[PDB]
């Protein structure tokens, strides 16, 4: 997960980032993944679901 910025808000998103990747890959609703990812506060998601530079 990117430092400084908000990509967790308390809970790690890296381990979950795999879910987003797998889902978004096949074509699954990422926002739904966000629910699974477990990223408190949308302040992170809003940046993730859009950017979330997984590369
Ligand atoms: Zn946050």
Which method resolved this structure? NMR
- Compute the distance between CA of residue 20 and CA of residue 30 in angstroms, rounded to an integer: 6
45, two tokens: 């998601």
20 CA → ligand 1 middle, Å = 17
| 27/16 Cα distance (integer angstroms) | 17
SS3 28: coil
Chain centroid, CA 49 distance in Å:
6
Q: Which helix (H) or strand (E) holds 10?
A: none
Instruction: Identify whether the C-beta of residue 13 lies closer than 8 Å to the C-beta of residue 46.
Output: no
Structural domains of the chain ordered from first start: 1-55 (1.10.10.60)
For the chain, where are the alpha helices, taking DSSP H only?
14-26, 30-37, 42-48
Binding residue ranges: 6, 9, 43-44
CA angle centred on 21, ends 16 and 24, rounded to 5° = 125
Separation of CA 44 and ligand 1 centre (Å): 4
User: Using an 8 Å Cβ cutoff, are 39 and 8 in contact?
Assistant: yes
Binding-site residues for Zn(2+), please? Answer: 6, 9, 43-44
Distance 46 CA to ligand 1 centre (A): 9
**Which candidate, 11, 12, 13, places its Cα nearest to that of 48?**
13
């Amino acid at each position: 997960m990117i430092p400084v910025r908000c990509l967790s808000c308390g809970k790690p998103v890296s381990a979950y980032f795999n879910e987003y990747q797998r889902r978004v890959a096949d074509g699954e609703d990422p926002k739904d993944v966000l629910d699974d990812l477990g990223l408190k506060r949308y302040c992170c998601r809003r940046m993730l679901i859009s950017h979330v530079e997984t590369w």
